[PDB]
């Protein structure tokens, strides 16, 4: 199917407690594959998936150089942003950046990204054209002017249409055992009385990969998404994910209700019911 590669970066200033902490992770789809933390002893980018371990010493060296350079750039950006927002040097602030690419089943570029948040709010983003920017405010407009003058988008475009796609293709082949395997959910339905006249039906999905899934409850065929409690999809810690969906129903009307499960790993979508 379709795939993505994303690099995530967070810098968090901590006045009086040294330089900002910098943490960056790389993903292919929902699989973590590299990490760098500036607070590690003598920090290096480290592998986190088996299929990247085969990259040579030169790969780790270049990646490590890039991570350290990005940390320094983000330190300068954080000092810049204090100026742009007229802020004191006393508080902790946060700079986030995600960049990467989406590709289709045929490996062709679907979309590229390069976007930033300051203190949890949109700051600047590369538009889908990979040629222009959206600035969230007058501060980000200053960055936009600078990056336009420097033709920074041209460099981003070349990377996103070239190396981003090409290296994603390489990782997908090298990791084809896992990255190109969808593990279906293991499912069941639990029943919990609330009161004399109501009960909770909970539909469970466990052990699935990737995280994309649809869990819905129907009453005699009618979607009940208005009344369905859907927890956030959560990591199991072994690459897989978990999720549940619950509906409160009238006692003795449980057989009206079906849970419907759609996932890439399933031979067919499931229709489940409470089985006494």
């Amino acid at each position: 199917g379709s795939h993505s590669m994303r690099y995530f970066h967070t810098s968090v200033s901590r006045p009086g407690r040294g330089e900002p902490r910098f943490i960056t992770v790389g993903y292919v789809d929902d699989t973590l594959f590299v990490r760098f933390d500036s607070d590690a002893a003598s920090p290096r980018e480290e592998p986190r998936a088996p299929w990247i371990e085969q990259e040579g010493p030169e790969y780790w060296d270049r990646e490590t150089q890039i991570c350290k350079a990005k940390a320094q750039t983000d330190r300068e950006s954080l000092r810049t942003l204090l100026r742009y927002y007229n802020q004191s040097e006393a508080g902790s602030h946060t700079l986030q950046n995600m960049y990467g690419c989406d590709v289709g089943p045929d490996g062709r570029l679907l979309r590229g990204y390069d976007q930033y948040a300051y203190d949890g709010k949109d700051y600047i983003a590369l538009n889908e054209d990979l040629s222009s920017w959206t600035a969230a405010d007058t501060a980000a407009q200053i960055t936009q002017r600078k990056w336009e003058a420097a033709r920074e988008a041209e460099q981003l475009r070349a990377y996103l249409e070239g190396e981003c796609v090409e290296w994603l293709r390489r990782y997908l082949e090298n990791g084809k055992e896992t990255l190109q395997r969808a593990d279906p959910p293991k499912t069941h339905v639990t029943h919990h009385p609330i009161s004399d006249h109501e009960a909770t039906l909970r539909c469970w999905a466990l052990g699935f990969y990737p995280g994309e899934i649809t869990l819905t409850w129907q009453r005699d065929g009618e979607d009940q998404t208005q009344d369905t409690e859907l927890v956030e999809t959560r990591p199991a810690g072994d690459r897989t994910f978990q999720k549940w969906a619950a509906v409160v129903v009238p006692s003795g009307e449980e057989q009206r209700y079906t849970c419907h499960v759609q996932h890439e790993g399933l031979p067919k979508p499931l229709t489940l019911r409470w089985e006494p």
């Binding site: 967070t10 943490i23 992770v25 933390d37 203190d119 949890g120 639990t190 466990l206 956030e232 959560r234």
Partner: protein, 100 residues
């Protein structure tokens, strides 16, 4: 600055079976700023040697982390996750409930 309080889920990697080794997870998500304190508790007591994932974030920029430890559940032992964050006036404790 806009702040977002964490969502908290406490759960096991595999379906709990008494006497069988497993992993206890506390997943904290949807929060900002990123500084957060997360402890796993056994019978009210802080578990030593808890590991966590590297800070990452979702499409809306909110942060998430997974804290986890190996454990062997029993019928008697109670587990919980204790979370503190600037948005909370006191730490929030969420109990592990295997029978959801």
């Amino acid at each position: 600055m806009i702040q977002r309080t964490p969502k908290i889920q406490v759960y096991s990697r595999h379906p709990a079976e008494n006497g069988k080794s497993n992993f206890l997870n506390c997943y904290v998500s949807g929060f900002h700023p990123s500084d957060i304190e997360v402890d796993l508790l056994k019978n009210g007591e802080r578990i030593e040697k808890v590991e966590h994932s590297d800070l990452s974030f979702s499409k809306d920029w909110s942060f998430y982390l997974l804290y986890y430890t190996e454990f062997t559940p029993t019928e008697k032992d109670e587990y919980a996750c204790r979370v503190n964050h600037v948005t909370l006036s006191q730490p929030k404790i969420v109990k592990w409930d295997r029978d959801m």
